Amino acid sequence: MRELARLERPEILDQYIAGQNDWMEIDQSAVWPKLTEMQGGFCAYCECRLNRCHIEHFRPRGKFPALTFIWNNLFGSCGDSRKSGGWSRCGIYKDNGAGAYNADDLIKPDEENPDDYLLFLTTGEVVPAIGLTGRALKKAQETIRVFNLNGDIKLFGSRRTAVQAIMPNVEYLYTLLEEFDEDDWNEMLRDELEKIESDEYKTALKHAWT
């Protein structure tokens, strides 16, 4: 997961008020293009390419009905309740499959940098970052557990495979550091790091390259 930059707030959230209005009422096609600007057409938590996608309340509408029509609270997550059943990570699992959790002990990707908490191994596990204790460890652990970032075999598989595809190219660049002057080699690495913004699982590919 990525550090997201939440920039501008859409007009429609002003109109609807919590208590009176329900989430079934609000029009969703107004909300999406601002999220798609933020998130780049990728999921908030896992970084798949969004195709079946829903608006997710980071703090849910049951436990926090005050935090409902709040631009901070909304994120575009992979999965859909409507089109098919039994989705097993991210938004849908946080509610259904991840049972009890304190929402305070989760990484919120708009507020925080995830990179200090999470580490992506090239073998395709996501793990807590090197040298965390107490609360910083507990956030890393619970984020991994609640969004099901290792436990979804479909996701674990896809990420592992995506990284293992590029590991010849990583290996090969860091041989050529010997031969070239700095500014050409630094341009080469800048380029590869430019491409992976178009790619799925961009954080995991970054950790492989950098």
Binding site: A165, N169, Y172, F180, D184, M188, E192
Partner: protein, 535 residues
């Protein structure tokens, strides 16, 4: 003699037994201790001091084999190969040999099963006979127990006789010592593909043969087990657990006493009934005494052991119990969280349940003196272990079996790379793919299988490509790479078309497309390097 005495004191079991037979105390105890002594491991598992396993097998002019020699592992051996390589033939050969032990444990001079003149002789055998030679091990006292089964073809230039005396001699030791004092006995079983068979709901009324200890040897090497016998035996155990026998004896004793008082009071009409009740009491006491005399585990404990085994080994089954529904005893199971009858189980679940239940039953019956009867000794042959199992179960099946039955020698056949990924290469014996029946030794694969990727096992061990060769799309990424290499790494009109085809067929986030993208990127970088070097 003095020589036998020396060898016996040196720990030779046969010499000790011969001295026992001729003098018919000390020699008996020595033989019994050789068979019974063992220790509990650091892991809490009982381990016999003198293990029993098949060490070596040799096949001469048997079915497809002119000559084959196999060394077997003490714990687990897996035989792999293409269809028609003779994997099943190997298990059949072993089972026939084991039949000679079983026959002689049951009855003095019992005969095991013989090689078929029609099917077991190789079709183009010059010598027109077949031999199955096996060597067994039973502790340091008996390092070699050689057996040979032989059969000559119909035209009969000379009769070739089987040599089975060592099997008989060893089996005699088990039989005779057991007769004097109950000992634990080895389990021998074959589970071939015939274990897949529909379940009959109609459970046979208790004639009472299923409770006899040596019913454990009844069609053990037939290939299917007897799951019907399990169900009868399990219901029997349930009924006996609900009904205490000694209270029935006490109640019967009280009834006999009351009836005796009535007869003493002048009512001669009830004398016939008194005699019947005295008979019933004597029978109940005898059963109790026989139960007491057998040193056998309590029925409650037996039931619990088997239930635990089944639930541990069979993933979809969390509970098994006997219900009295209407006027009939019915076995029920909690399968995938729902209560169902055995007849409602899927074929895969039932087949696997049948195997484990049968094996557990036999082990409980043959190992009454062990705290955990499933830690008994024996040799179990399983053909096509993956039969009816989904990949998820294939990843757990070997681990679960070995955990439930730690001292059984398992000799198994498989076609599953998933199964092989859980087993060490030392346990694997592979036929070469181009074997025209004149391979002398089965050997271990070159690659380590345990913990290895499935794709690698398929290619390196089973000689199967990761992608299906008879599908055009299976070649596209390979062809794409070749086109890139042919055009000095630049994406030309032809390479672009194929790229678009890959994208269209496999999709935008497909592995195949990502590999293609990777190839483009790496080749561009290689070319940039080449240009910098040229300048």
């Amino acid at each position: 003699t003095k020589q036998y005495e020396r060898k016996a004191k040196g720990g030779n079991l046969l010499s000790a037994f011969e001295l026992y037979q001729r003098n018919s105390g000390e020699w008996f105890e020595m033989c019994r201790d050789y068979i019974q002594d063992g220790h509990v491991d650091e892991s809490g598992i009982f381990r016999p001091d003198n293990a029993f396993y098949l060490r070596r097998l040799t096949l001469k002019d048997f079915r497809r084999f002119s000559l084959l020699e196999i060394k077997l592992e003490e714990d687990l051996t897996v035989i792999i190969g293409n269809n028609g390589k003779g994997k099943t033939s190997i298990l059949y050969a072993i089972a026939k040999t084991l039949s000679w032990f079983v026959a002689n444990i049951l009855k003095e001079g019992g005969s095991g099963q013989r090689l078929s003149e029609m099917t077991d002789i190789k079709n183009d055998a010059e010598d027109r006979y077949s031999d199955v030679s096996s060597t067994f091990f039973f502790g340091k006292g008996l390092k070699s127990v050689p057996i040979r089964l032989s059969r000559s073809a119909l035209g009969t230039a000379e009769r070739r006789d089987s040599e089975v005396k060592p099997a008989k001699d060893l089996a005699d030791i088990w039989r005779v010592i057991n007769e004097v004092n109950t000992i634990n006995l080895p389990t021998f079983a074959l589970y071939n593909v015939e274990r897949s068979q529909p379940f009959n709901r109609n459970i046979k009324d208790n004639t009472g043969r299923r409770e006899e200890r040596f019913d454990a040897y009844s069609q053990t090497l037939g290939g299917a087990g007897r799951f019907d016998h399990f169900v009868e035996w399990y219901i029997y155990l349930h009924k006996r657990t609900v009904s205490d026998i000694s209270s029935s004896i006490k109640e019967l004793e009280q009834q006999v006493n009351d009836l005796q008082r009535t007869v003493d009071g002048g009512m001669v009409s009830v004398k016939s009934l008194l005699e019947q009740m005295k008979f019933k009491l004597s029978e109940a006491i005898e059963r109790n005494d026989a139960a007491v005399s057998s040193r056998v585990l309590t029925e409650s404990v037996q039931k619990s052991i088997v239930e635990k085994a089944i639930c541990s080994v069979v993933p979809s089954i969390s509970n098994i119990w006997v219900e009295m529904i209407t006027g009939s005893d019915l076995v029920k199971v909690t399968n995938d969280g729902h209560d169902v009858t055995i007849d409602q189980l899927s074929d895969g679940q039932r087949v696997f349940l049948s195997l484990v239940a049968d094996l557990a039953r036999r082990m409980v019956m043959l190992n009454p003196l062990l705290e955990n009867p499933l830690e008994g000794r024996g040799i179990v042959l399983i053909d096509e272990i993956e039969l009816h199992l989904h990949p998820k179960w294939q990843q757990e099946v070997i681990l679960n079996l070995r955990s439930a039955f730690p001292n059984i020698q398992f000799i198994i056949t498989t076609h599953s790379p998933i199964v092989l990924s859980t087993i060490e290469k030392r346990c694997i014996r592979e036929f070469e793919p181009n074997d025209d029946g004149d391979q002398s030794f089965l050997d271990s694969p070159d690659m380590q299988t345990k913990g290895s990727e499935n794709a690698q096992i398929l290619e390196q061990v089973m000689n199967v490509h990761s992608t299906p060769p008879g599908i055009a799309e299976s070649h596209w990424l390979g062809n794409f790479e070749l086109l890139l290499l042919d055009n000095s790494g630049e994406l030309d009109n032809h390479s672009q078309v194929l790229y678009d085809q890959i994208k269209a067929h496999f999709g935008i986030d497909s592995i195949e497309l990502k590999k293609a993208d990777s190839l483009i990127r790496i080749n561009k970088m290689k070319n940039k390097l080449n240009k910098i070097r040229a300048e």
